[PDB]
From a paper:
The [name]-2 β-lactamase is an enzyme that efficiently hydrolyses carbapenems, the most potent β-lactam antibiotics, active against the broadest range of Gram-positive and Gram-negative bacteria of any β-lactam class. In Gram-negative bacteria (such as E. coli), which are leading causes of antibiotic-resistant infections worldwide, the primary mechanism of β-lactam resistance is the expression of β-lactamases, enzymes that hydrolyse the β-lactam ring to abolish antibacterial activity. Our search identified [name]-59 as containing a single mutation within the α2–β4 loop (glycine to aspartate substitution at position 89 ([name]) compared to the parent [name]-2 enzyme); but kinetic characterizations of [name]-59 are so far unreported. Experimental kinetic, biophysical and structural characterisation of the naturally occurring, but previously biochemically uncharacterised, [name]-2G89D mutant with several antibiotics and inhibitors reveals significant changes in hydrolytic spectrum, specifically reducing activity towards carbapenems without effecting major structural or stability changes.
Numbering used by the authors: 24 to 57, 59 to 252, 254 to 294
The structure:
């Protein structure tokens, strides 16, 4: 009834891109939604790292000393693209610092260290089940989880489930209030998403996001919570993939899909 009240040209956009685009956007005020391929599975790539940080924050509600716990690691823990943790190899970092690095720099060593704390891919999946997400699955570690193989459900979710879980964790009651705001603040501080959903969001609105880029199969994504001034926040997810292993991803297509989602919701930008 409130889904796709206004049609938008997502099909032309994905055809120009040469792949598939999945979009689910929720106006948390009215409950109106924009939905395009929203229940298809797409690879998470680095976007799981946002949910990883939320799972750590959930654990910190029962373990008050968790976030400030200092974690030492060896050179064997460094994974390609670990821009923060490589600078602290000789000192260690706290759990909170590793969480911020995973969210805000997509730091791979930090992500694997935090996965270990939670009991691996199955432990993160269990956390997502605990907030009512039956779609999300993490199966592998960095970097193997980026293979983005067509038809492979490992390490995937849907745009809809991503948006629904993001809403629960940033605006709903899945986290206690202090942890909720810390999750929001980490997302707001992301550095990797300036050319994705943020490029469609006016500079005078608050926004937090987490990107994903698999490096193959034109596969990349972003999810965000957006606070337009004077109205309720919007939660949205934009995922892409393409049929050929060497197909390139496009940041511009993600930004364009976000613009169409905001237009479909009647959110003036």
């Amino acid at each position: 009834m409130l889904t796709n009240l206004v049609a938008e040209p997502f099909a032309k956009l994905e055809q120009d891109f040469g792949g598939s685009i999945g979009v689910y956007a929720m106006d948390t005020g009215s409950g109106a939604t924009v939905s395009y391929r929203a229940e298809e599975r797409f690879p998470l790539c680095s976007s799981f790292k946002g949910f990883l940080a939320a799972a750590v924050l959930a654990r910190s509600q029962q373990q008050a000393d968790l976030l400030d716990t200092p974690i030492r690691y060896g050179k064997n823990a460094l994974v390609p693209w670990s821009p923060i943790s490589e600078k602290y190899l000789t000192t260690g970092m706290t759990v909170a610092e590793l969480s911020a690095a995973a969210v805000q720099y997509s730091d791979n060593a930090a992500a694997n260290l935090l996965l270990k704390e939670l009991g691996g891919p199955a432990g993160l999946t269990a956390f997502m089940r605990s907030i009512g997400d039956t779609t999300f699955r993490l199966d592998r570690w960095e970097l193997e989880l980026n293979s983005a193989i067509p038809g492979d459900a490992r390490d995937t979710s849907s745009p809809r489930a991503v948006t629904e879980s993001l809403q629960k964790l940033t605006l709903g009651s899945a986290l206690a209030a202090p942890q909720r705001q810390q999750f929001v603040d980490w997302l707001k501080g992301n550095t990797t998403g300036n050319h994705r959903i943020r490029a469609a969001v006016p500079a005078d609105w608050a926004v937090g996001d987490k990107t994903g880029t698999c490096g193959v199969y034109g596969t990349a994504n972003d999810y965000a919570v957006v606070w337009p001034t004077g109205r309720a926040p919007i939660v949205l997810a934009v995922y892409t993939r393409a049929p050929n292993k060497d197909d390139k991803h496009s940041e511009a297509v993600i930004a364009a899909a976000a613009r169409l989602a905001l237009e479909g919701l009647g959110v003036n930008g």
